[PDB]
Input
Amino acid sequence: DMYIERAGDITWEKDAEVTGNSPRLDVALDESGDFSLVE
Amino acid sequence: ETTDGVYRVMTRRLLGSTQVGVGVMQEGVFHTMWHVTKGAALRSGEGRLDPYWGDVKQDLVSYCGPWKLDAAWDGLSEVQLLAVPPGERAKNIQTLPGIFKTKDGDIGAVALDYPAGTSGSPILDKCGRVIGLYGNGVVIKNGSYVSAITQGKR
Ligand SMILES: O=C1Nc2ccccc2C[C@@]12CCCN2
Ligand SMILES: O=C1Nc2ccccc2C[C@]12CCCN2
Output
């Protein structure tokens, strides 16, 4: 049995930690909702 | 609880209490990824939330009403993932999205790695609008994870 619990407001934070790269990838999405890399 | 905001999705079916995902409450509708709940009913205190719309291929589901989130990534600006990891406080992470290029068009993607139970965490623009949910993606050459910015249709 599943239940929900509040975790916070949805707001933009000024001076949040900035990280992560921005890759451009060729991908395919199957009927099951799974993504796969095309190469 | 019907207050707008980000929520953890929990289960007691496994050992102890386990966070299986996250979702967004907006305009009286609860929004999460399909793989988090599998389309099952949810509990909010004494209240029951019934699924209203879902689609395995988009990997999305809404409860109590139709999908309400319609903001989109502008394709240029940095965004924030409002990560809600299992057992940890909600935390904003700012990033410049990458792109998933598919035969049916391009989608923004965020290259951030969190435990699977973080799925459903919202990605936001600078106005605080939800542009999609984190948690459906791929593992690349590097071995790192990249999630699509998954958004529904209002
Ligand atoms: O490969 C993964 N799948 C996944 C699925 C949904 C959400 C977040 C993730 C990241 C993860 C789990 C831990 C290592 N990387
Ligand atoms: O990159 C990560 N971030 C993170 C953040 C919070 C809690 C646990 C983790 C571990 C890891 C590595 C593999 C699973 N995700």
Observations:
- Residues B 85, 113-115 surround W2M (ligand 2) (CB under 6 Å).
- Chain A has no helices and four strands.
- Strands of chain A lie at 2-8, 17-18, 24-29, 35-37.
- Residues 4 and 25 of chain A are 34 Å apart (CA to CA).
